[PDB]
């Protein structure tokens, strides 16, 4: 697949890895999303960064709320802005 | 990189391929986003699908509006729901 098709296919696959764990495969809880981020990204050196720590706290404060695919993708965009190196500056 | 880190890195790279063409590297126009989708995804067989055609029309109707990285990622999530096979059902 072209690079962007590859990217989308990976986003979908990782969503379904966690959304399939309980109930509806169309959603995952914010508790589960926090677990997904900590397991699927090499983020362990950055979890105490001021902005990333607030995103993780917000997931724990809203842990039982569900997230659909669109909201998961939006959230990954928010996290990339404060996590991915190429988005610095 | 882990799969999701790979996915994010590709999203960022394709954004910057187009956002760097004019002006600010932090945004791209909706005209440019339409070009990005048509060139970076194997979507040519699906452009007349009822839902995809409306997303492409909306980009052309708002062609001069700018899009930041967060809005680009959100948009890719919207498109994936109506384009990616694994999101059917």
Contact status, residue B36 vs residue B20, Cβ threshold 8 Å: no
Residue B7 has its nearest CB partner, among A10, A36, A81, at: A10
* CATH code of the domain occupying A1-89: 1.10.238.10
- Contact of A45 with chain B, judged by CB distance below 8 Å, is answered with no
Look at residues A56, A6, A47 and name the one whose alpha carbon lies nearest to residue B42.
A6
Technique used to solve these coordinates: X-ray
Q: Which residues of B touch A41 (CB under 8 A)?
A: 2, 4-5, 8
- B21 to chain A nearest CA, in Å? 16
Q: What are the residue ranges spanned by the domains of chain A?
A: 1-89
Phi and psi for A68 in degrees, rounded to 5? -90, 180
Residue B3 has its nearest CB partner, among A14, A16, A81, at: A14
Pairing, β A66-68 against β B27-29: unpaired
CB contact under 8 A, B87 and A12: yes
- Give SS3 for A15: helix
CB contact under 8 A, A16 and B86: yes
Contact status, residue B84 vs residue A8, Cβ threshold 8 Å: yes
- Contact of B86 with chain A, judged by CB distance below 8 Å, is answered with yes
Contact status, residue B63 vs residue B32, Cβ threshold 8 Å: no
The CA distance from B46 to B82, in Å, is 10
Specify the resolution in Å. Answer: 1.1
Structure tokens of B84? Answer: 């990616």
């Amino acid at each position: 697949a072209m690079p962007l098709d590859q990217a989308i296919g990976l986003l979908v696959a990782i969503f379904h890895k966690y959304s399939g764990r309980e109930g509806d495969k169309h959603t995952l809880s914010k508790k589960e999303l926090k677990e997904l981020i900590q397991k699927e990204l090499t983020i362990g050196s950055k979890l105490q960064d001021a902005e990333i720590a607030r995103l993780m706290e917000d997931l724990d404060r809203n842990k039982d709320q569900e997230v659909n695919f669109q909201e998961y993708v939006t959230f990954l965009g928010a996290l990339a802005l404060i996590y991915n190196e190429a988005l610095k500056g």
